[PDB]
Amino acid sequence: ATLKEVEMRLKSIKNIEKITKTMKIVASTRLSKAEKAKISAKKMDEAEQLFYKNAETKNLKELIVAITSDKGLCGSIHSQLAKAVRRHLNDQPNADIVTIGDKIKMQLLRTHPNNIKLSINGIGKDAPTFQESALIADKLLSVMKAGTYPKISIFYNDPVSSLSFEPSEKPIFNAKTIEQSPSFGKFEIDTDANVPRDLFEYTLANQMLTAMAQGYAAEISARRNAMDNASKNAGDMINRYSILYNRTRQAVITNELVDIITGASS
Template sequence: MSRSKAPANTYATLREIESRLKSIKNIEKITNTMKIVASTKLSRAQRAMFDSRAYGETSDEIFKKAETQPASEGNKLIIVSSSDKGLCGGIHSQISKAVRARLALEPEADLVILGDKAKIQLARTYASNIVLSFNQVGKEIPTFAEAQTVADQIFKLGKKYDSIEIFYNKFKSGISFEPTSVPAFTEESLKSSPNFSAYDIEEDVAEDLTEFALANAIYWALAEGHACEQSARRSAMDNASKNAGDMIGRYSILYNRTRQAVITNELVDIITGASSLQ
């Protein structure tokens, strides 16, 4: 009785292994394809990132020469640059961790979040701080028009902020990034700069300059974050493909061993049956 049940169980196990092996091979094809797509998008994202740095660094040069400093008191705003997409490692959780660390020091600060991933994570503990959120921003290559739209919506909130800080992932290399923050100076901070008198700037121009500088900083953060996201996704898909390859190797060995055991059991049954007839 036991000998008749063993082959059925073995065959079922063999079919399960074959099905699992086929599934893993399909997953490997998908992750390899996603890696290739991410690599292609990364090169485009890096070009956009270098362009945005030219905008951001040129804008920052004015504030550096004016020795502008952010206000230490008053209403504070934190802008978080993230995205809506996953499958890119811990890139979103790291930026959320950095923001939570800052909110522990500034619990009354308002939050403007770009991207659903960071919003979901930060809303668990700081939902009341979120005053504005965006999705589908920087879905492809970020543009200055998108950054300008975000900046306009922030000014339309009608609340006067004394200091603004932007958190984003800074691109360091093809395999590494770092959560970073940069200040976005307000009109009052610019006017109170020690070297502001060196610039012949009218009142309305100073306001326009700070608004333009905020849009520049947001564009810079979006472009840097997008490049980091594509880089992280390429690394994640590369690791997933390697893991799938390792699993395919292990399951192939298991499949061959199980198949050999099935064949051996069938030969034993045939030989035993033939011997009993003699």
């Protein structure tokens, strides 16, 4: 009800506004740079998972890896993905969990503290790179012994448009599971040096980079979208408070004048 209050309550929102409006452009510059990594990733995966299609490979304990990031302000990316892991993970309250990005953690940490055995950090900054995808894979083999699992599953957000997305699941097959397939014999693979070992380890890295690249571009599209709605919504409050400001300012001049007036009359 005082000028100071209304003027500074305005100064909080006017920046909130300008800031959310900046990260929509920083989000838009980051948009194309990341639509590009998604294209390069898919294209690589298309050459790799096409072999699994021909071998007609299926699955004869469990590891779940769910991918988002650390940063919020991207709408419901972390939420309805976490929810997709809830829907699927009803069938397996004993599936070990590695999470990529702190937000899917605080989602999955509060719903199932114990399943999370591993958690990755500082992810959604720039676009995902192979190094990330690889060293995360490396540790999934190291302490998580990813090899010694019947079924592996990657969780990530696929971007359908620039307005919506779909939480998706795709499987990972190991050294063993590749061999005992409907059509391993279609290919003249040399059965000498540990090949299925590698094609699994190489795929573990790759199918994640591809999940992250898609999860990233989904996130980046969701940011520019949530921030557009926010900057819009902020301006609205700025408008409503510029009006209250103006009322109060007028009131202040009048009320001050009435004291001078009463004082003058006596």
